[PDB]
Amino acid sequence: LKIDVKTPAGKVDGAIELPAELFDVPANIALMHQVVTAQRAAARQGTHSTKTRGEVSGGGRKPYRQKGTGRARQGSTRAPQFTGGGVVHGPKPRDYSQRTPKKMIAAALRGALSDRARNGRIHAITELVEGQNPSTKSARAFLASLTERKQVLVVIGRSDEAGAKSVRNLPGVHILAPDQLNTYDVLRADDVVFSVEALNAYIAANT
Amino acid sequence: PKAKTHSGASKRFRRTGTGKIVRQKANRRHLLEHKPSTRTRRLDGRTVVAANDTKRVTSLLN
Amino acid sequence: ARVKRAVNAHKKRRSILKASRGYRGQRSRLYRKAKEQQLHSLNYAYRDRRARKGEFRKLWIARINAAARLNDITYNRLIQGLKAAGVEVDRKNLADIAISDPAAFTALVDVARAALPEDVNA
Amino acid sequence: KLHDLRPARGSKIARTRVGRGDGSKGKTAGRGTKGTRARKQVPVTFEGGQMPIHMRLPKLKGFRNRFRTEYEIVNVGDINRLFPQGGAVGVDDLVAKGAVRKNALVKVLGDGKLTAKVDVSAHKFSGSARAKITAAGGSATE
RNA sequence: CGCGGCACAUCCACCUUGUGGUGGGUGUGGGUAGGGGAGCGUCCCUCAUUCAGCGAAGCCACCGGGUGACCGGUGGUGGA
RNA sequence: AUGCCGUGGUGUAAAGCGUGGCAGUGAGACGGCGGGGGAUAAGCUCCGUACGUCGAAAGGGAAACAGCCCAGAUCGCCGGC
């Protein structure tokens, strides 16, 4: 409910009270399931193309007339059952996305975050830099010393000095700004890292 | 892409405040001498659609 | 996503042929010809287990008749007598006795003869 | 997590693949006849041999006006439970509560026991509405 | 009828005394078009886990396994 | 005589009715009993029956046999009636 971690190359800083949105929420897995599936659906590009009759060159000729041939009722050389033919009910390039309610998305997200908080998986930080320049090495040591896990979700904001630079090249580590805070990432990552500014804007936005 | 409603159905049937459909009976516009005022009273009104064809009509109007 | 359905076909295909070994001609070589024969083979087995039961009854009965006539008594009167005595013994083991131990068979005949009432009147 | 995440029982019923054998549905598996139905879905309008019910029946009498200035409805009983304290009533407050549509004039019903003594800013009250309003002790506007 | 094993409704007693199951009893269980319910298998993606050039996949044979769509294991070929 | 409507008791896991969703059938044959056309006819044809069976039902028996007789297979049994 109200806990913080240490600071890199320092001592300790934080002590920010968190509301009920990040702890006292009985998350519903059906809701979370529906939202997540919708997200992976929308992430699909819809390039699943094909080609059928009318797009294939030729095939308008009707050889082998209908009596005295001993052959089948041909009608066209590009018909499905002939090789080199078209595709029946093929994968037309669907562009699709399971448009959902904002209430469902928000409830799922705060639910998952409340599960991580209940399980002690929140690592609220103040910053992450040796003053100005980035350091993959330093962030690796800090995060490996704090979280001791593989998959990490990081929330900083629009600060590219080292927040959105030191975390790169770190297998299993993803980073985003609060406004782009989805649930798939949250449910995947265990030890979720938040900046103070991230909590300030996020909490204020959600009252 | 977008539905259509059968026009003649929309011009003959009227949905009420609830799940019911009515028909204006009017077999009384051509010849009325041999028809008595009794038969015209029988025809006069808006009766309820028979349940043996509401299952078709509701899709005709929707 | 082209799946290339061959594997699914090959499973039941080889599964049937390896069980189809023993038939003549194409019946033990080709899937579509072997498949048909197995349909009729299994219907035959289905009814033939029942027939097998009945046929074994008939063989057992016939042998019982032979032993009985060697003991100067018919099957009809033998079974009637065994019922009157109360000898709830099957025909299977009765025939086995009729072969491996004719003496005990004859003893059972004497029991049945004693158990019969008198004649064809009631 | 995702390895625990699962759906609610009763949703996601198996798609019925049709032409996939006899154990599932059949060789024709739905169009189980040999007439038209085996090739084409039939117009629901078209009966098949007789004058359609549409043509058979008479055209519904009457007409629709273009200039039908329809008003929305405010139930005075709903006012009673919504504003038992009275205070102030008006278009903006009613839509602020969400009891009535916006951008339109509203009438008041005689449905409901009104006790809250409050004036009502609205249009085209029925006589029973005025009787209830002044019986409580309020006043109509126009 | 007898001697045994599965299944759906129902009756009864228990576990959340129908979430769904557990124990017992009666009756039920031929079936096309066709309705309903639950299932088998293949390919791809995600997550977790995990075997693998000390030999994966595919293929061949063999021995077994499930009520079914089918599976597992062993051996050989081959080499991701 | 049968048959039919309706009522009151009795008996039967239950069928029925209304209400919605999704299909099929919309060519029927024979036999039994009553009828018309036809010649006192037909493996003829058009009807009726809360008559069945086949159709969609395997098995026994009728020599073999879809429609008649008996008999409605959950599976197994080298058990009986």
Add this chain to the structure above:
RNA sequence: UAGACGGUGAGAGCCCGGUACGCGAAAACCCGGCACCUGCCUAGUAUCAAUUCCCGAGUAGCAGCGGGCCCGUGGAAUCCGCUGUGAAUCCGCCGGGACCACCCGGUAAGCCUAAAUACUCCUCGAUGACCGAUAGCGGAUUAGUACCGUGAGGGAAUGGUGAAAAGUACCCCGGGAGGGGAGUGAAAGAGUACCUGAAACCGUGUGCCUACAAUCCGUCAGAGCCUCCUUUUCCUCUCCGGAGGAGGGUGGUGAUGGCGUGCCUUUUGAAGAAUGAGCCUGCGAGUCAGGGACAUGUCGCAAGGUUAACCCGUGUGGGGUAGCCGCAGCGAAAGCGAGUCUGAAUAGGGCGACCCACACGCGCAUACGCGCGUGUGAAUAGUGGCGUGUUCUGGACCCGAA
């Protein structure tokens, strides 16, 4: 600030080419700053009178035959074209759905006008819950080639050695091809006809049956041989083994007997002398778009719910209330409104309200429940998303007519 892909002898952050990131323009060229260059302007504003003149001419409008506008000639506006007649210059003209009057809006019959928008042969870069050589465009291979056709046009099939060619020197059969022995190679079970090498098919060897016997070519009974194998008398040669034999038991063959009219399609009715299939391999037929529509299961909220378009942002997140369905219906409509309509009234009747295990106060009733307020907690809901089944329009399960 380099874990993007890839290559390199088997799966590479640190072996390579590369990426991140940061550099890099003589000459040409698009945009862009500046100069020259070019070009407009010696004021028409304020006020008043309206006697004068102008304000788009074979035009508008009108009549006729048509198009098109929700609008099929219908009462037919406006717009467009054709043919004859043929107006006005502000006290004018057009329009406001035949039309007249009043009111209002605006001044046609000259021209130019960027933005938002539509499309990608073609050129860089990038992705892909798209195929991976009978699929993808037909074209990974001499591809719109070969080939067919006088011609318009039609229109094929063929990928894989091994990491490396290390391409079997030499010797022996043989006319050669081809093969063999050596040998390279990890491997030749990797030899140009080359990864794996399936099935139909041909063929060699071998255990069993078969030349006196008729049946969809099997099943069930079932003899006796043969392969294998356990226990055992026993071979005691026994610190070895199962030689052989009996018996027992897997997997073949199966003498001989019973039983039995092949699949599918379509049919009242089929094994068919009713149709289709030579066999194998691969491919091949109920799917998808739409805030479509009815019903349903389940999941958000709760008299609400929901956003579309579009904006911002990066993994598809947050905004965005215009709009829709529900919220009171009846009635042709005016209009009325928990009633309303028809109708002289409505007594009646059509659509919709409000169904109590019931207490307080209370009319009704012996009891049974009707009712007005408060209540023993009396009866309660749609909406949106995701699946299912159906359906409309989309080629719509698929193939084929002339």
